Amino acid sequence: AAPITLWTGPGPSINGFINDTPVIRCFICLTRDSNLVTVNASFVGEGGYRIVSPTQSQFSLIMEFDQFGQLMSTGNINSTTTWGEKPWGNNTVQPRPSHTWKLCMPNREVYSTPAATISRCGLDSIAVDGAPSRSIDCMLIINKPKGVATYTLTFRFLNFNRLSGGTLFKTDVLTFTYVGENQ
Amino acid sequence: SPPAAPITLWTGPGPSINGFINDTPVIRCFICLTRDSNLVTVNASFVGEGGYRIVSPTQSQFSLIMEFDQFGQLMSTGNINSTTTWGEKPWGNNTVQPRPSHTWKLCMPNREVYSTPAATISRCGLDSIAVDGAPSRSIDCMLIINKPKGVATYTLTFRFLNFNRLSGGTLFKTDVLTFTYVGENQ
Amino acid sequence: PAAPITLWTGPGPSINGFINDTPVIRCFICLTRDSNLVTVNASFVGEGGYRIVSPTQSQFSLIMEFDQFGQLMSTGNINSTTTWGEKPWGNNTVQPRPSHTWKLCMPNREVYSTPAATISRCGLDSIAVDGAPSRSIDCMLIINKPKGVATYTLTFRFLNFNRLSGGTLFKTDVLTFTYVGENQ
Ligand SMILES: CC(=O)N[C@H]1[C@H]([C@H](O)[C@H](O)CO)O[C@@](O[C@@H]2[C@@H](O)[C@H](O)O[C@H](CO)[C@@H]2O)(C(=O)O)C[C@@H]1O
Ligand SMILES: CC(=O)N[C@H]1[C@H]([C@H](O)[C@H](O)CO)O[C@@](O)(C(=O)O)C[C@@H]1O
Ligand SMILES: CC(=O)N[C@H]1[C@H]([C@H](O)[C@H](O)CO)O[C@@](O)(C(=O)O)C[C@@H]1O
């Protein structure tokens, strides 16, 4: 029994794709400790998504994993960009899969039907000094079916119409938690 | 051996209708308390049944209180209690091991840190996938830590509040809720 | 192989949050590093002029400054002039002897090479007011916003007091934040 972290590494490329177009830089870290997995994530919109307006359409960024906890090539965030294990003691991304990667996955029996957590997602919070009307929502959906994925994690960005105006799509550090899979 | 110290107490998956109000089973409560090195993470979700299947904006607030004794044993007298499934989750499987160990105390909220009651009030989305996170489909859930109840040494209270935020009748199918507190010393 | 460590103020902190060299807030701060992430667990109680806060309250930051070894410096709003050190597993003491392990509680400098933030709800007097929606402010954690010669900073910035419906005891909820911990 050991902890394990899967992540994008620091300074991720534009690795969030909508219609195969790179539009969002996603820092994603999945850390499994004894029983629970902590999702630690942040996002920076690029190009057409650098600035979001109150009329921005909602969207999902879905990660698809196989039965062994390996990130598949077909999600919005996928294995074509940097993804792998974080060794304790350095900031590298180790791409070679281990059986242990399954421990970062959402427990299939606990999440046998889809689960969700919708939380505030502050945008550009330092520069707008946390103005209430500069937050959207980001909902994590756990194990909503997608393709032939065994596990899915979806980051769904919602309620842009709560924004008072155009806002730089520079998210806060977001945290979610779920029960990890058994080896 | 820091790896020797973590412990998880939980209901197991697919809990029964194990949340009681006035001795009537009304809510299915998935509760997981995971102690790692120092902090305990509460991971919880709830599904209303019977008259609590759907909640309206005029719904009265309520507490689901878990009472624990000084050894971290869930007592039989709370709204969520030891008459239903509760015990340790072994690393590597989804069983519930009901035989109390002294290690169970490590999942409790530290008596000195929480020598007077503490709280965290947070958003509690209802039916979030089906309503696509509509802002007016959230209530609040407040975790109260060590508010006295009877002779419990520790208490954890899930208090559901601010149903008047809801735009209408909503399925009482909560998000996965997370809270954190300082764990008790062995 | 992971090595957990907790740095904290201990329970019942003194008035250890200073604004303009005046002690105004009792700050309970716990930084707990497990395998990869640090969990910030904190709560605050105002004293004197900050005992009660009103909708007209000006925003403020409580900054913790740490050096390259993860040792709390003397120059932040929360600083090494008050109780701060390691929490031993099994008791509630505060051990002041610095170790190479203290760096593990710091925000990873490569991950947070520019400042990061998390703005979250901060309920005030929540049990007494029964969680009334108009009794919350916000608390934003800012990670590694530059200050002085600190290598790492953690800033608790209290904001949006105008969300309050009136004078409210500045007795915060238990607040939690998470960030990627520094490498040994
Ligand atoms: C209640 C109060 O004094 N509020 C002040 C606030 C505090 O004095 C301070 O945050 C305590 O640490 O200070 C404010 O102004 C800041 C400046 O003093 C600082 O030089 O630069 C800061 C930005 O980096 C900021 O402008 C504040 O925190 O906003 C002003 C506020 O009224
Ligand atoms: C900006 C945008 O394209 N939004 C559209 C999204 C995205 O294409 C996908 O979520 C990306 O994965 O798809 C929708 O079905 C949705 O999720 O509600 C409709 C929405 O208008
Ligand atoms: C739906 C309901 O019954 N609400 C009532 C609750 C519950 O009976 C208990 O919280 C269950 O433990 O009790 C109250 O005293 C309370 O907590 O404010 C009054 C409230 O009207």
Numbering used by the authors:
A (entry chain A): 360 to 542
B (entry chain B): 357 to 542
C (entry chain D): 359 to 542
Could you pull the original sentences from the published paper?
To address possible sialic acid binding via an alternative approach, we soaked CAV-2 fiber head crystals in solutions containing 2-3 sialyl-D-lactose. The crystal diffracted to 1.9 Å and the structure was solved by molecular replacement using our model of CAV-2 fiber head (crystallographic details are summarized in Table S1). The electron density maps showed clear density for six N-acetyl neuraminic acid (Neu5AC) moieties in the asymmetric unit, three per fiber head trimer. We found that the sialic acid binding site on CAV-2 head is distinct, both in sequence and location, from that found on the HAd37 fiber head. On the CAV-2 fibers head, sialic acid binds further away from the three-fold symmetry axis at the periphery of the trimer. The residues involved in binding (Asn435, Ser419, Ser416, Gln417 and Arg515) do not align with those involved in sialic acid-binding by HAd37 fiber head. All seven interactions between CAV-2 fiber head and sialic acid are hydrogen bonds or salt bridges, suggesting a relatively strong interaction compared to HAd37. Unlike HAd37 fiber head, no hydrophobic contacts contribute to sialic acid binding. Finally, sialic acid binds within a basic patch in each head.
Our results showing that the CAV-2 fiber head contains a sialic acid binding site creates a paradox: both HAd37 and CAV-2 fiber heads contain CAR and sialic acid binding sites - but HAd37 uses sialic acid and CD46, while CAV-2 uses CAR (CAV-2 does not use CD46 to infect cells, unpublished data) to infect cells. We show by structural analysis that the CAV-2 fiber head also contains a sialic acid binding site, but in contrast to HAd37 this site is modestly involved in hemagglutination.
